[PDB]
Design a protein around this nucleic acid. Sequence first.
RNA 1: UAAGGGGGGCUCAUGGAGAACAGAAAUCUCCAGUAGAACAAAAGGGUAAAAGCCCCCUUGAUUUUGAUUUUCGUGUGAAUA
RNA 2: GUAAGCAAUGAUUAGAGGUCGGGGUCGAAAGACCUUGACCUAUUCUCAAACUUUAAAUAUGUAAGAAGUCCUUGUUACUUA
RNA 3: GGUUGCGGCCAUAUCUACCAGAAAGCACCGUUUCCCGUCCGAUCAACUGUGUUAAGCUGUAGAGCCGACAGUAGUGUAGGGUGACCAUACGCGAAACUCAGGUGCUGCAAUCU
RNA 4: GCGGAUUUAGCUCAGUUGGGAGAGCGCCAGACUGAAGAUCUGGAGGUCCUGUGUUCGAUCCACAGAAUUCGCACCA
Lengths: 92, 151, 237, 116
Amino acid sequence: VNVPKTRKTYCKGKTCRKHTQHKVTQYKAGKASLFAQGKRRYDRKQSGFGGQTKPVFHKKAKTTKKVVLRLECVKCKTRAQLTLKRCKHFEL
Amino acid sequence: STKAQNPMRDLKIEKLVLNISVGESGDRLTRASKVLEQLSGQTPVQSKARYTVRTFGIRRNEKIAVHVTVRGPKAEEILERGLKVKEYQLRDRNFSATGNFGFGIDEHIDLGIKYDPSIGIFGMDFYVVMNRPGARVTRRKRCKGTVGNSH
Amino acid sequence: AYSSRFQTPFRRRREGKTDYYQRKRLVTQHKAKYNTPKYRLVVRFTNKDIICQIISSTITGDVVLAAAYSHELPRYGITHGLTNWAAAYATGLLIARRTLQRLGLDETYKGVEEVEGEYELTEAVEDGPRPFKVFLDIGLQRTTTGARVFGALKGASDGGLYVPHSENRFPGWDFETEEIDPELLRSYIFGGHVSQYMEELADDDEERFSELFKGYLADDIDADSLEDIYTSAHEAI
Amino acid sequence: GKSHGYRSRTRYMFQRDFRKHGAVHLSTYLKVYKVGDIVDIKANGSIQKGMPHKFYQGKTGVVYNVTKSSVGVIINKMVGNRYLEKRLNLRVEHIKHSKAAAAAAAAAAAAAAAAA
RNA sequence: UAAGGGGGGCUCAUGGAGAACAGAAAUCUCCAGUAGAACAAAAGGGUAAAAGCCCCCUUGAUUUUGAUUUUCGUGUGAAUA
RNA sequence: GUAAGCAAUGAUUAGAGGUCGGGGUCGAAAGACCUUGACCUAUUCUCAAACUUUAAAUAUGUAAGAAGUCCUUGUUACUUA
RNA sequence: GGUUGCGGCCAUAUCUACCAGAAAGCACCGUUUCCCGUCCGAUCAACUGUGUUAAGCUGUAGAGCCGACAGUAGUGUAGGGUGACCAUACGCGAAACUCAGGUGCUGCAAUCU
RNA sequence: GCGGAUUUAGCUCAGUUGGGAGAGCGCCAGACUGAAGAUCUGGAGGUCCUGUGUUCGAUCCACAGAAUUCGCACCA
């Protein structure tokens, strides 16, 4: 399935209320954080005693969970993502 | 009677369809459609197709040939153009059991077209049928207008 | 009947007049919309009259509560045949004002003017409003622009029994339309465009005036489409 | 062996009827209920949104009330655990009509004393 | 991203009967019949009031909620005015 | 759907009817004369867990009753105009 | 006395052979600048011509469909016997087969008599 | 987390930042030899990976994708 990568629709995050042009986009990436809970426990030496269970390798998930259709408003900065329906192969 | 008394159950007609078989198409569909248009003076239908078994490679889905359906007194004029001159080329009476009168005249050159607008040889159909059951009853409409019968 | 255990079809469906899809999403509201010809507030084409009613609660179906009639137009001052444009507008206005009953004056008595009760009115949104109002039903044929159904809807609306509407599928008053085969005469709503065709002339097959649908009438009783005929009904009601 | 859900075991309770096949007429469609109307139940795959459950057919029941309007309405019936307040949701078409005979016994009985 | 909403229009697959043609037929037509065709992918199942055929324009792949109930011990889930 | 059955669908036994096909014979290929196998249908007869037109006693659910509630007129507030 | 509509409502409401009526009311007959639509006159249109049409009714039994009286299988709760089965307490008891039967039921609206 | 090579006629491959491409082996046909080999002639076989651009003009330059191939970093 493909949702279009721009539609006009209702003003979802109701900063206008009345219907506007939205832009259907996706999020960013940047650094690696470093200060984050499992990263603080991992390279330290923790999980206490018991193995090398110091928060380990790949903590995973499956193929496509939901789809990233973020409806950015043209008035404010406001974001709306809903419960988005599924796809097996999407592109932006 | 035999339910046949009034002008309706004599026969006011439905349709007297003209067709041209298009066993070529591609570039040359413009031959068939423009020949229909030149005799009648009407917009042809680039046709539907029935759902049957897939002969050649494609049969159904593609708008393959071309016909033109016409009803009313508008149909009786184009009937006269095929009857009054084009029947008296090479044609004797054809009728099925239900009583379908077809036409199929390789002389496209007499009425309407010449050899100049054409690609090569071909004829054209005129399914000038009658909505009343049986070839005893269809032949009644054509014999009151007096067509060329082979006895 | 057919294969297995099987149901034979409904008689009125086979009879070729009663529909059932139209009978689903239409009746659910139960405000002021019924007529004996078909169902809901129908404006039919006929050779002559239409009945036009509203709902009434009875076991078998709807019964007459308030109503009018098309031959309750010579009531005012039309005296001709049974067939034109002007009668459709007039009978729509007549039933809308006649929220008494057929034997009555052009007054309210029952309860309704527009519908049963009053309700809310927001600003205009489409698709899903709260449509608690009157359907002016077509009945059978094609919803062609300019037709008698929509001409009767205009008379009905702000006349009393309120069916809402835009101005797209509708005739006007000045411009109706209208086709012609040759003889010689005219009738209309008011005057309009048929009296402009009267430079070339020739118009007729099918009687005139008083009730719904058919035309003009050829014999010289009134040769031009004048206002005086229609205004004897329209201003009088 | 079997999976659960739709048509398993009681296929007939999912199913329409062979005799009464086709689209459902305006009988139980327009017949909306209120307090204390005794009713029955049988489904089909004709009404899509608001189809009742198959296990909780077979059982009869009474309408509690119609809550607000027409859709989202309920029918009371026991489930075979023990006696407990259990119901079932559905919309109008699945609901039938039954024994309004029994309650008219009291009105028949009351024609007693004045025969003196 | 139309392979959605709304309006308007239509009833089949298929057979018989042949028509210059024809190769079953192409296209068409008279005559007869009507949910047996059509169904992402499997099996059941629905359906002509159409869930099939046909044509054009629309963007609801929607915000904020939920009476009253499904209902598993639960995690967790549905009908839902 | 036990019961009972071959409508529908499923698997095969019988009489015969008979288009076309197949075989035989005369014919240059082409054409002509005969005849053993078809639906249909009449007569005769078999028959099925994913095949069911019709459809108990008897046990069981769920509701209701044997153990007292039905109905008229007027007013107030919500829903509801 | 009749015509037309709304139904509710599906197989005792279904079909054929064949007859018969016309303007209270209904339906066919016949055709088109220009709106409006296309492949096509499916929106709209005078005196009149006419039962072609369709709703309906009479005449009618050919077929769907239909039925007593009578005959009868299984069997709970139990209770008596047998190798591949048969027979009973006790409460009810069909098709197949047949005397025979058969042209719906009910409510509502408009108009004339 | 980040970068390098390669894609050219069936197959083997020669070769290139703008005037738009090249030979063997094989395939076919005619010469030629006493014949097979050898070799000329004629037939040919590709818009240089693909979608879309820049330019007077594109194998060549650009944005972007397919796909064989190769390496460091990963967290520790």
